Subunit: 399 residues, 4 copies
């Protein structure tokens, strides 16, 4: 064969069988996504060669019948620590990878919450890529990381699929690899009996950039004013809750700080309350985005609400909202998205979605699966416009 995923298999082979199985269950889809997103052949080789060298060893064992790994990830249905997502606009689509980098003692007494593998991966990316900055990672790792004893405590109070402290995404954008990370607040909250709100904002307010940037301190107090009445004041894990803190692994003055809420209830009034920050945002841009989100939910794991802030900007923007799609028929989802894209006037996206979906996941019949689409994120930005993020359980789509 002569497609890049095939050529790279032929050129590089595999250090071990797990890496080979990961390639066999993901690289073909990845090359198809890249192709369908109009990445050049040179960028397809770039990202697939990157994937081979850096990501395959980070994915740990390939969970399969008869081989049960010590560490089970909540990123996918089968426990595989990988997702592939697309960020769609009217005119372009970006591919992103989401993973946990699995350490070799992950899920055992010497590393109960997989505390080390992501930062090792990011260390290797820092020597690969000139623009990668580890200072925000390190800052939040210091604030919400746990020692081994604490990690062992947390594993006693959390389901197997939530034994995590961090996870990593890689945006494959502008011919670069752009890393970002999310940190879990729940283990520290549980182990220290600290309110999740308190620890989130304590960690944020100790950032060097917070100390240097008045506009960020302005946006953050507004967010605190919105969130304080809505999340617990005590130490319980009662949604709605501040469950993740996200940063970009770039210059801290350029990084978006993300505060992610998880909740199990989402009805119209809450979508409204989240999206407008309780009536704080009432401008036409926010309201057009709201219409979009209400329409999506009508046309169609916790819900996600992600508030993203940037140094230099004092005003909050509407969040990105995440809908879990696990349990919903994938062909139905496809047909609903086609409708939604037509509603948005993204005609070319509507005309190609379903056929391109089948071509991403040729081993599976999408009319009969319910776990291939895992999440959908919807956003509206004053400057970039509407976008949709679709997260796929790539392993479910290949096995």
């Amino acid at each position: 064969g002569s497609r890049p995923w095939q050529i790279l298999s032929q050129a590089l082979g595999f250090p071990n069988y797990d890496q080979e199985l990961w390639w066999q269950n993901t690289a073909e889809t990845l090359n198809r996504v890249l192709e369908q997103c109009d990445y050049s052949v040179h960028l397809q080789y770039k990202y697939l060669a990157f994937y081979h060298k850096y990501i395959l060893p980070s994915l740990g064992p390939f969970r399969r019948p008869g081989v049960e790994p010590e560490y089970i990830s909540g990123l996918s249905h089968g426990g595989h620590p990988l997702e592939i997502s697309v960020k769609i606009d009217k005119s372009k689509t970006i591919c992103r990878l989401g993973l946990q980098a699995i350490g070799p003692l992950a899920g055992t007494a010497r590393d109960p919450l997989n505390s080390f593998g992501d930062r090792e991966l990011l260390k290797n990316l820092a020597t690969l890529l000139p623009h990668v900055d580890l200072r925000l990672f390190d800052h939040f790792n210091a604030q919400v990381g746990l020692d081994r004893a604490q990690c062992a405590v947390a594993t006693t109070k959390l389901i197997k699929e939530s034994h995590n402290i961090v996870c990593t995404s890689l945006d494959l954008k502008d011919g670069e690899v752009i890393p970002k990370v999310y940190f879990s607040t729940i283990p520290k909250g549980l182990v220290t009996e600290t309110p999740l709100f308190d620890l989130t904002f304590a960690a944020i307010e100790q950032m060097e950039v917070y100390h240097k940037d008045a506009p960020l301190r302005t946006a953050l107090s507004s967010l605190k004013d919105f969130l304080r009445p809505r999340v617990p004041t005590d130490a319980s894990i009662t949604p709605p809750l501040t469950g993740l803190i996200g940063v970009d692994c770039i210059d801290p003055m350029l990084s978006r700080l993300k505060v992610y809420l998880a909740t199990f209830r989402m009805d119209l009034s809450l979508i409204r309350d989240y999206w407008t920050l309780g009536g704080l945002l009432t401008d036409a841009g926010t309201m057009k985005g709201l219409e979009m989100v209400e329409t999506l939910a009508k046309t169609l794991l916790p819900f996600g609400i992600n508030y993203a802030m940037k140094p230099g900007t004092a005003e909050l923007a509407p969040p990105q909202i995440y809908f879990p799609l696990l349990g919903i028929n994938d062909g139905f989802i496809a047909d609903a998205l086609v409708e939604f894209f037509q509603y948005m006037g993204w005609e070319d996206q509507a005309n190609r979605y379903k056929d391109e979906l089948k071509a991403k996941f040729p081993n599976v019949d999408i009319s009969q699966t319910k776990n291939v689409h895992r999440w959908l994120g919807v956003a509206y930005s004053e400057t970039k416009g509407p976008s949709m993020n679709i997260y796929y359980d790539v392993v479910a789509g290949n096995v």
Copy 2:
């Protein structure tokens, strides 16, 4: 041979020649120091095996004639990223290793200040040892580390032996390995054109434990009041200066925070000023330590060091540890001086064995002829623990 260093060579061999050379110029001395400090044979194997597995690969290429590494360390005279030290009390002597963990791209464009190797080692120590903790490492790495472009700027403003941000020490204490790290403030100060005093305290004041611990804040407040009129208010790298921030890689509530001053000027009057915090400390214990330190200086190039160590839950400053620079002074003279100081302290047994044991620690060089083997001598007095002496050796200088 059947000594532990030899047995482990025979059992383990070496992955590459540089590691073999490191072992050949350090492992015998380390085994000797361990023996001399009355470590059991089982602990000697524990530490030498640990050294072989964890430390040898972290030391990088062995700088030698015809082979010049990309990365040159300031830890030793020959550019080797290694020191061995002993801390001597009344009751016992502890051995400690000091290194920089050299990344494989260190001192090139992809890693100009060797920014990654020490954290890599510490990660490996965290799955090895159950009480190793990375949170203070990570905090100070966030606050005084630099991105690649900044690291590149810093190499244009620093001599080649100062292209570093962190180094690591490992106390071989009880039967454990206890890691500590020290972060340099100079690269960030130079790149951001920020006074060293300001960026040092800015980084400390953002610690989680600073926010939780009134006693630590109070101690730090007293230290700032002492330091502010003595160290530069401008961005200059001139003495005395706040050059390093030390932490123990343990539960941050138990970690000592160390602020290390470097300076070239020292006389009995400055000894008193540092030791007593300009008259703040006046008690019997402080004045007794002061007398000891004065006597050492009388009995006796790199800067002097002054290390102020603070613990969460302690509100008051104690006197610092004072480090005497010994590079360039003949090592036989130093051994005679130490024998004298030991007798002055009443440490007869230490006085009577110091010279013979020195010879025996460095059998492949005549230590009476060298001037680089003793690098530093630190002296401290604790109300709790009594007086102690830290002797730091350039092990490679004592072996090549």
Copy 3:
């Protein structure tokens, strides 16, 4: 804990969980065997450190409930590629390790018969140990190894526990590590449809040392004359058969060449036929060994083994080593039988300690309840060295 196996765990930790599990189910027993054989503490550290560094990564995944490796070994009952043996004389007891070095793609399409891992280990042993020699390994790898397509054919004609071409033993003798290997003739016989006898002797007769050494050729000629009417002339895999070729990984002029027969039928008459080479050997030493072997059999599923060992510069065959298969027979009964045989041999001290030491070697299982821990018992008599007994243990079966 302060025993060497514990100290090395504490010093070294583990690269991954499988290695940790291997250490947790084998290292205590190995330390016990070493102690029991009167190895000094320095040798105990030497061998345990060697085991940790070289052997743990070679053992592959630790087969356990919920985790089924791609490659299953025939060396043990649970599929683990490991055995520990002791060779007991009048004067002393030597410990030996037996393993297959598992490649990372072993038992998949890219490496169906685990064809690479053992040579990789041996390469690492050659830079570790100065008297390790790869030439006979390489010779037999050339003559009875198979390419990938052939290896794939062989997996269709063999049970999963027999997907192998080579295995390795390491004698822990004097203060050294002495490697030996054994090559299987079965895969090549099956794939090429060639009689095992023919391909075994073809491979031997192409040795450089065969061409240089008349005495070896003469010995081999006598062995062929004995074997030819007893083993199949056709291509069948039926007993008695020439199933393994053993060599020592040393100077080929000093290496013993071993031809190992497997067979299921054994009674006193066949014992005599094997031991005396069908009446060829009639001397006092041979008949005395014969009596010993007969008594063992009376005192006492896997095939019997018969191992004919030949040395360059020796023209005459000596009696073989005979291996009794013990899998499935209760281990407390075996211990009682061995005590009886030891008393018969006059080895009182061995008789008096066998059972207590067995218990102590396998402290996490009750060896009186098991039937898989003793796997093999080999017995030999040398004119030169006297009688000896090799006991092979499924260490993992004695620990899980």
Copy 4:
């Protein structure tokens, strides 16, 4: 940049600085050679990704001012264990890599003759490539390899650049990687005081394939009849001598066995004696090849003569002859080859040689270098026709 060598640098980075320097001094030229030989872009990525993963770590340290490695290779002027060669016909050109794979203790007491690194590389290729066969390697490694003590002896009697037992070539042909190896007879001859002739033929006559193939035994006795009067009968290292044994790492029934003579004298009468095997080959094909070789030498380290035999074939063919080009001006060499290609009627090769040469080695002025062309090999085959092999010191052409 977007050329494959650049893309792969961006995607993969480097495990260490030596590997980065090797890439910086060879990968650009390699991509240019591949390009100039009309390899597709997919094969350029195949071979460059292979190069990165398998060959860079095998090349050991990058010898440079201030960094003197323990092991110095005789493959190049600067001591670098690498060459890049092209095999030219009238219609196509094949690129090949020649190296020694450098072990981490090479040239020190634990590995005095670099005895291990090639077989480790070949082990990794055997899991990469289905067609790679290690049985001939192992056979000859057993016959001419030395133990450590013996290796240490040999290093006392041989120059630093001849402390070798094996070397490896990789033909980049038909979208595959095809390995072949040469083994050095000199260390064993020196250490055992055995005649080189005796040990060469002893090793060959112990091959399993020799025992199975009458035609090969027929060709080999003819070669012995030719060589016995011409090389030493005693154990001295007096050229002409049988100095290398070459095999292909493939099915032993398909492998060409090569017996390489080294000599320091080459005049017309010897070229004649070698090429015709002493008057044994007098057919028109042999004689047309002879004309070619005589013309080449007129138009333009020991000389090389390589006799290659294949199982199933009883008759010998003319050897390939190797001319060392070290010390001769590279622009002169270029202009001479241009003339030679015109004499052969390879007009298109003549018209492109010099410009393509400069483009392979843009960092150097070929009119002023004398070490870029290291060797030239000339062959004539009954079935494939004439061919020329040109061996470049790629590091000399880049530094």
